[PDB]
Amino acid sequence: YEHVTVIPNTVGVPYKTLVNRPGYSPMVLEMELLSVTLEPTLSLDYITCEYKTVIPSPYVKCCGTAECKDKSLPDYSCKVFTGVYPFMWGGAYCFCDTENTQLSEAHVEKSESCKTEFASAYRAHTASASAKLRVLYQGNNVTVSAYANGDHAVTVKDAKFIVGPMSSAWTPFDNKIVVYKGDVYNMDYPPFGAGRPGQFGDIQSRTPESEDVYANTQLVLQRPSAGTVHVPYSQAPSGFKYWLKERGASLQHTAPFGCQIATNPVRAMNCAVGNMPISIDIPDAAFTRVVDAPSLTDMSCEVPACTHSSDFGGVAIIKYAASKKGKCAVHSMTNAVTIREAEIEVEGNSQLQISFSTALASAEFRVQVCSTQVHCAAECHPPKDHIVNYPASHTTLGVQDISVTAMSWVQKITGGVGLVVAVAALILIVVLCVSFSRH
Amino acid sequence: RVPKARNPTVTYGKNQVIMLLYPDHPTLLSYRNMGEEPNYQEEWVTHKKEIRL
Ligand SMILES: CCCCCCCC/C=C/CCCCCCCC(=O)OC[C@H](COP(=O)(O)OCC[N+](C)(C)C)OC(=O)CCCCCCC/C=C/CCCCCCCC
Numbered sequence: 001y002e003h004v005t006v007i008p009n010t011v012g013v014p015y016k017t018l019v020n021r022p023g024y025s026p027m028v029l030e031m032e033l034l035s036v037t038l039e040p041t042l043s044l045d046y047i048t049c050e051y052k053t054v055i056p057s058p059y060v061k062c063c064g065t066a067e068c069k070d071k072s073l074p075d076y077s078c079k080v081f082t083g084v085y086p087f088m089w090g091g092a093y094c095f096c097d098t099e100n101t102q103l104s105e106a107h108v109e110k111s112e113s114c115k116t117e118f119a120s121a122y123r124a125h126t127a128s129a130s131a132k133l134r135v136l137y138q139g140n141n142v143t144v145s146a147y148a149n150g151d152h153a154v155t156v157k158d159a160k161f162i163v164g165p166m167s168s169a170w171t172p173f174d175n176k177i178v179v180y181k182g183d184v185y186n187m188d189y190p191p192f193g194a195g196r197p198g199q200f201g202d203i204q205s206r207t208p209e210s211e212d213v214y215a216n217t218q219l220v221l222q223r224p225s226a227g228t229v230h231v232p233y234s235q236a237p238s239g240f241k242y243w244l245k246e247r248g249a250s251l252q253h254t255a256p257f258g259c260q261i262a263t264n265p266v267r268a269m270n271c272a273v274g275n276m277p278i279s280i281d282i283p284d285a286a287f288t289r290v291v292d293a294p295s296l297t298d299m300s301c302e303v304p305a306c307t308h309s310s311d312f313g314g315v316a317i318i319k320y321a322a323s324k325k326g327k328c329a330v331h332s333m334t335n336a337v338t339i340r341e342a343e344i345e346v347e348g349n350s351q352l353q354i355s356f357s358t359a360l361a362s363a364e365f366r367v368q369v370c371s372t373q374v375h376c377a378a379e380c381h382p383p384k385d386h387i388v389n390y391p392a393s394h395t396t397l398g399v400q401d402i403s404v405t406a407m408s409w410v411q412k413i414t415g416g417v418g419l420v421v422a423v424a425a426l427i428l429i430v431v432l433c434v435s436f437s438r439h
Numbered sequence: 440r441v442p443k444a445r446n447p448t449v450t451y452g453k454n455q456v457i458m459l460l461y462p463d464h465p466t467l468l469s470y471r472n473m474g475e476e477p478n479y480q481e482e483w484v485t486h487k488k489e490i491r492l
């Protein structure tokens with residue numbers, strides 16, 4: 001037997017389904033989503049790190065002028081300053097007081113901390129969902145883990161579930177993602193070869209093992225001061241170290257739908273968007289003929305207490321007469337009311353208690369207990385506690401499953417208006433007919 | 440190793456949470472709706488404070 005159903009993508013709320021194969025005792029399966037994962041496919045763009053400026057020892061020319069050698073390097077800059085008079089500890093270094101020149105040169109490299117402290121800029125463009133599911137099949141809790149692309153089917157207790165694909169393509173990640181350690185940020189980094197000084201991406205490397213580093217930090221060499229033999233310069237500070245100070249808040253704290261984010265690999269977990277098609281496939285040998293299961297008759301319902309809380313604030317007590325001792329599968333026939341029990345033991349002339357949860361303020365629902373249905377009715381009362389730490393177990397309220405009994409006020413006032421309108425229309429048509437016959 | 444802040448003193452009201460906080464040092468408080476529009480907000484609290492979310 002093949003059964004196909006849809007459950008919401010909410011994690012932690014169990015949903016019941018009715019595998020009703022006529023001629024056999026109905027079977028109710030309660031399934032809960034323990035976790036749902038979205039794993040985007042990532043293509044690395046370039047690693048960003050902290051640059052390291054390499055200044056070799058300056059070359060001073062004694063009694064002469066040096067020339068600016070040119071070579072290809074990440075951010076190579078070379079300058080020659082004339083008229084310097086370097087002073088070391090034991091006296092002046094050059095012989096003459098002028099015509100001495102200092103050759104300065106500097107470039108940038110990836111720091112040795114590249115292999116540890118780096119931020120990776122990615123592109124995320126498609127997501128392969130996974131899911132861990134808890135299914136209560138035949139009165140046993142069995143947990144399954146499967147891919148939610150609609151392709152992986154997991155066989156548990158001889159019935160196989162094939163879950164997915166999710167109804168919504170939404171994902172917290174944009175087209176361009178940067179991760180640092182365990183935080184991932186939705187940012188539009190500059191393309192490779194177009195970084196700006198003092199901003200994220202001033203130094204860019206294709207991979208953490210590549211060598212063709214692109215760096216743009218406006219390294220400017222400045223003239224040594226007053227007989228000192230140092231090499232001053234003016235460089236825009238590391239863009240990456242500036243980013244670390246001004247990151248903001250990761251996706252983990254700002255993503256919508258209560259999304260949880262992680263890394264290694266980057267995933268988004270437990271989104272609350274859309275719903276999840278799920279298909280069961282039960283062997284024909286799992287079912288039980290209707291003439292072997294207990295058959296309940298002479299059934300009646302009373303609802304003593306009823307509070308429309310988030311948890312199960314309702315109680316209904318059902319009188320029955322049972323043909324024989326056995327289990328029965330209790331299922332609510334109304335979407336507005338959620339029943340906590342999935343099956344209950346039954347024997348003789350007795351009563352059974354089921355706990356339900358509703359958002360209705362006038363609970364009217366049908367409960368089916370092993371092929372027999374009964375009608376339920378109560379007037380709910382609001383709870384006192386304004387806030388709870390758990391999500392609602394019941395379906396949200398519609399504008400039809402609305403308006404408690406004692407909405408009869410609506411019927412009465414609209415009926416009075418309709419009667420006035422009907423009387424006015426009757427008088428109008430009577431007068432119109434009398435003046436149309438009259439001539 | 441990093442420390443964990445003291446548990447606040449929560450109190451509820453109609454569509455509200457009243458939180459009394461006891462920070463020993465600058466502590467970050469952030470909160471977001473768990474719907475379509477998260478409306479993320481944050482602030483550093485440095486002394487005893489009461490918030491109404
Ligand atoms: C002094 C005498 C007084 C007499 C006393 C008696 C008065 C009793 C009444 C009070 C009026 C009842 C109003 C209560 C409304 C309950 C709110 C409700 O239950 O609503 C809830 C939904 C909210 O949506 P959600 O986000 O929760 O669901 C989506 C969920 N997610 C996001 C996951 C997809 O609201 C909806 O969706 C509704 C969608 C449609 C909204 C348009 C409403 C149009 C109605 C017009 C009425 C006029 C009559 C028409 C004239 C025809 C001529 C006969």
Ligand SMILES: CCCCCCCC/C=C/CCCCCCCC(=O)OC[C@H](COP(=O)(O)OCC[N+](C)(C)C)OC(=O)CCCCCCC/C=C/CCCCCCCC
Pocket residue numbers: 364399400402403410411413414415418419
């Ligand atoms: C002198 C001779 C005089 C003779 C007397 C003649 C007068 C006779 C009467 C005329 C009265 C008819 C008025 C029309 C109303 C008909 C609507 C109706 O008959 O009801 C339909 C259903 C009833 O439910 P059910 O159990 O049968 O169906 C479920 C069945 N099951 C439980 C098995 C699944 O109800 C629903 O579906 C919901 C219906 C849609 C509700 C729309 C939302 C309500 C909005 C209200 C806003 C009004 C504001 C008022 C405040 C204004 C300030 C002044």
